[PDB]
Amino acid sequence: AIYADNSYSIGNTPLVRLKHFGHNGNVVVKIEGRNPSYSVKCRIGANMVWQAEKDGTLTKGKEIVDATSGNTGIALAYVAAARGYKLTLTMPETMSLERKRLLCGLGVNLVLTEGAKGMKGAIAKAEEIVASDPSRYVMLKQFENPANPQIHRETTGPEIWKDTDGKVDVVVAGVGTGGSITGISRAIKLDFGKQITSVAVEPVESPVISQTLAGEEVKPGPHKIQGIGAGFIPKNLDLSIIDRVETVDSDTALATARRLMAEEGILAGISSGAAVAAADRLAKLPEFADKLIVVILPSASERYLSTALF
Amino acid sequence: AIYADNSYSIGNTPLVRLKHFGHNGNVVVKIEGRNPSYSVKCRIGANMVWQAEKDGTLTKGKEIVDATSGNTGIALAYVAAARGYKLTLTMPETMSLERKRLLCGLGVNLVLTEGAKGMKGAIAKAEEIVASDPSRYVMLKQFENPANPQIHRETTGPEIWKDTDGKVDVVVAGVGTGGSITGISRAIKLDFGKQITSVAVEPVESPVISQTLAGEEVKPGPHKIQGIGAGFIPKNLDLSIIDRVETVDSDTALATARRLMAEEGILAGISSGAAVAAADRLAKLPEFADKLIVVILPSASERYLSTALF
C-alpha cells in the first residue's frame, strides 16, 4: 500500500457517529478533510487529470488552466505538482494574501486579474489563455466534467456502502458542482440497488435548486457558506437522483460548524456546518428517526481561520 | 467501520513514494496530516485520555490541564470535546491570535499568562491549577507519559509494517517528545523482529541528542523547526533504540517543505521538511541505496500559513 504519488492516496475517509446531533446516533459524518489537499476536491483533482490523460487530452508538456482560488484550485495544484504539470490559475488581484501564498507554495503560476472584473475577470482570462494556444492548454471544467461525479461513484459512494455495511438510508450533501451527491447517489442507488434518500443542501440565501424544482422564480444571492450555492444549476448535479432539497442559512451553518468543533471535536469547515444542520433537521423527523443518515463534511476548519467561522 | 467518536478515527495514514528525493523511489513518507486534529499528536491525544480513563486517573467530571498551544494542545482539545471533558490550556498572552482563535473554536478554556514569563509562565500556572484542586485536575504530561510511545507501538509502527509488507529498512523521524520514533522503533524491532535503522532528527541549532550521545557539552538553542528540538532529552525518547542522529538546519527544513509542496504536491509542515532533508541525505549514501526509507511527516502546511514556510 505505497501510493506512487499523492494523487493515488485520495479518499478512504472515515465515518464518525455524532453525539449531539440526530437521535440515538442516527447521524454519521464522512470527513473529507482527510485528503491530500485537505478537501473533497482532491478526488476530482485526481480523477479529472487521470481521465484527461487516459483520453489523450492531457499529455506531457501540455499545461492546465483554471479560474479557481478555492478547494478545486488547491486540489488541481497538488495533483499538478505530483504529476509534473505546470498549472495556471487566474483570480482577481483582490484575493486573500493567504490563498495567494498557499497556491504559490504549491507552485501554481498565478495570474492576477483586474479587481473590478472580479470572478468574471478570471474566467475570461483563462478562456483567453486557452485560445492563445489550444494545443498547449487544457481547462478541466469542474462544473461539467463527468470525471467529477464519476470519481464519487467509484470511491466516495462505495466507501459509504462498505463502512455502513449497506445500512446507509440517507445521504446529505451540500451542492457546489453537484459531483458528490451525484456520484454517491448513482453508486448506492444504481450499483448497489438501495433506494436511499438523496438530500441536496443549498443556502437559503441562494436556493436556486429549490426554486427550479418548484418552478418558481430563480433568485440567486450572496451568502457565506463557502463551497456551495454557486447561484445556478451546474451540469454535474443530476436532478433526477435528488429526492429532497434542504435549505440552510449562513448563521446556522457557521454556528453548526462551531458546535461540531466545540461539542464533537470535529474540525469542519463552513459547508460542513450547513450539511449537518440540514441532516439534524431530517434526523429529528419521526420519518427519519430509525434511519442511518450519512453527511459529507467537505473540508477542515483551519482553512477558514480568516472567515466568520472564527 | 463507524467510529464512536473522533478519537477512535486516529491513524491509518497513507504512505506515498517521493519522486524528487532519494534514489529510485527508496524514500517514502507517512502523512500524519491525515488525522482528526491534522497532526501526529492526535494519536497521543486519543491514547493519553483513553489510558487515563482505563487506569481511573480521568473520570467523569475531572478536568484536563496543560500548557501547550501546539499540536498536542490541539489534539487534546479535539479529544476533550469528543469525549466531554473541559480542558484548560495555559499559554503566554503573547501567543498568536490564530491559535487563540483555533483553540477557542475547540472550546478550550484558555488561560493566558504574563507575556514576560513566556513558556515558563504557562507551565507554572497549570501546575498551580492542578495543586489548587488535585482531585479535580489531571495533567497528562506528553513528555513522560508512556501512553505517548505506546500508541505508536500499537498503531503507527504496525501500519508501517503492514503498508510496506515488512520491507521497511529505515525509519526517519524528528524528535519532539520522542514518542513517534520510540513507539515505531519498538514495534518493528521488538514485535516484528526486524533490525531496521532508527534515525532521530533534530535541529543543528539545538543538537542536544547528538551532543549527549557524543558526551559533548549540551548546547540547546533557538530554531524555527516547529514541533522538534525541545532543547533537552525527553523521557519519551528511548535512546537505546536510536541508531543514528541526523541534524538539519532551519533553512534546509523550510526549503525542503517548499519542495515537498511544489514538486511532490505534498502539503507538509516545517518539521516534515526537516525529516525529509535528513532522509534524502541517507537515501543518497550507497549504504542506504537499496533500502526502503520511511519518513514521518508530522503535520500539514496551512497550519504554518503565518510562519516562514510562506
UniProtKB/Swiss-Prot annotation, chains A, B:
It catalyses: O-acetyl-L-serine + hydrogen sulfide = L-cysteine + acetate. The keyword Hydrolase does not apply. Pyridoxal 5'-phosphate binds at residues 71, 176-180, 271. It comes from the Bacteria. Keywords: Allosteric enzyme, Amino-acid biosynthesis, Cysteine biosynthesis, Pyridoxal phosphate, Transferase. Hydrogen sulfide binds at residues 6, 34, 267. Its cofactor is pyridoxal 5'-phosphate. GO terms for molecular function: cysteine synthase activity; L-cysteine desulfhydrase activity. One of its GO terms (biological process) is cysteine biosynthetic process from serine. The modification N6-(pyridoxal phosphate)lysine is found at residue 41. InterPro entries: Cys_synth, Cys_Synth/Cystath_Beta-Synth, CysK, P-phosphate_BS, TrpB-like_PALP, TrpB-like_PALP_sf. GO terms for cellular component: cytoplasm. It is an enzyme of class 2 (transferase). Pathway: Amino-acid biosynthesis; L-cysteine biosynthesis; L-cysteine from L-serine: step 2/2. Belongs to the cysteine synthase/cystathionine beta-synthase family. PANTHER family: CYSTATHIONINE BETA-SYNTHASE (PTHR10314). Homodimer. NCBIfam families: cysK, cysKM. This is Cysteine synthase. It comes from Haemophilus influenzae (strain ATCC 51907 / DSM 11121 / KW20 / Rd). The gene is cysK.
